[PDB]
Amino acid sequence: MAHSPPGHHSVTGRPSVNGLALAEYVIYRGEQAYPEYLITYQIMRPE
Amino acid sequence: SGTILIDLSPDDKEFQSVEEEMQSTVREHRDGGHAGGIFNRYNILKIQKVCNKKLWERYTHRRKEVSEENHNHANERMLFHGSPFVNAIIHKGFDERHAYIGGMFGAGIYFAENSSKSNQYVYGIGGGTGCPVHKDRSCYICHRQLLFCRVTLGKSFLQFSA
Ligand SMILES: Cc1ccc2sc3nncn3c2c1
Ligand SMILES: [Zn+2]
């Protein structure tokens, strides 16, 4: 696993083309996330 | 492992706010649905609360460290994570085995505000070969799992990117 950029705890990937896209985030320490909810689902076929 | 899964009732305000964040963050993907399938919404089958004393104290311990390095600001988000290894994550927690070495921002653990983005990774990088049973990245039958995770960002490096 790589290191955060010096002086940073994470990386934000900000969308700079696709106007509808929300952000993605990267952490470099497993201890910086807690898996609070397990969601079981199916994707639905559009009508 | 120490992990117990508590079923939330569909009547529970917690089930309802988690379902709304799942449904409201679906978007169209530039791959036209290649990795994650073609869909506008989900059928939510179950929401379970993940309870592990040891993994929670490991989280709050690191969260206090980050906040003390960032003017008492953890910069905590709720974000989606998709992985074939959710069973290992809920029992043993996140670690370097859940990193992506070839990710656009290097070997780290990736999270998304878009549930539909995390959906592209449930069956592997770019959807892998799709569901175990039908080898179908757009399977409407097989049950998928996502995590909705508490994530400490602290001071985040801003990358402008396509
Ligand atoms: C490699 C990669 C890049 C972006 C994302 S956003 C997300 N949500 N769950 C997994 N991921 C990933 C994985
Ligand atoms: Zn299937």
Author numbering:
A (entry chain A): 1115 to 1161
B (entry chain AAA): 951 to 1112
Sentences copied from the publication:
The human diphtheria toxin-like ARTD family contains PARP and tankyrase (TNKS) enzymes that can catalyze both mono-ADP-ribosylation (MAR, mono-ARTs) as well as generate elongated and branched chains of poly-ADP-ribose (PAR, poly-ARTs). The PARPs and TNKSs form a family of structurally and functionally diverse enzymes, which are involved in the regulation of various key biological and pathological processes such as DNA repair, cell differentiation, gene transcription, and signal transduction pathways. PARPs and TNKSs use nicotinamide adenine dinucleotide, NAD+, to transfer an ADP-ribose (ADPr) unit onto target proteins or nucleic acids with the release of nicotinamide. Here, we report our contribution in identifying a set of compounds based on a new nicotinamide mimicking chemotype,triazolo[3,4-b]benzothiazole (TBT), able to inhibit different PARP family enzymes with submicromolar activity depending on the substitution pattern around the central core. The binding mode of the TBT scaffold was studied through the synthesis of analogues and their complex crystal structures with PARP2, TNKS2, PARP14, and PARP15.
Shifting of the methyl group to other positions did not have major effects on the potency (3, 4, and 9), and all compounds maintained μM potencies for the tested enzymes. Compound 3 having the methyl in the C-6 position, however, showed higher potency against PARP2 and TNKS2.
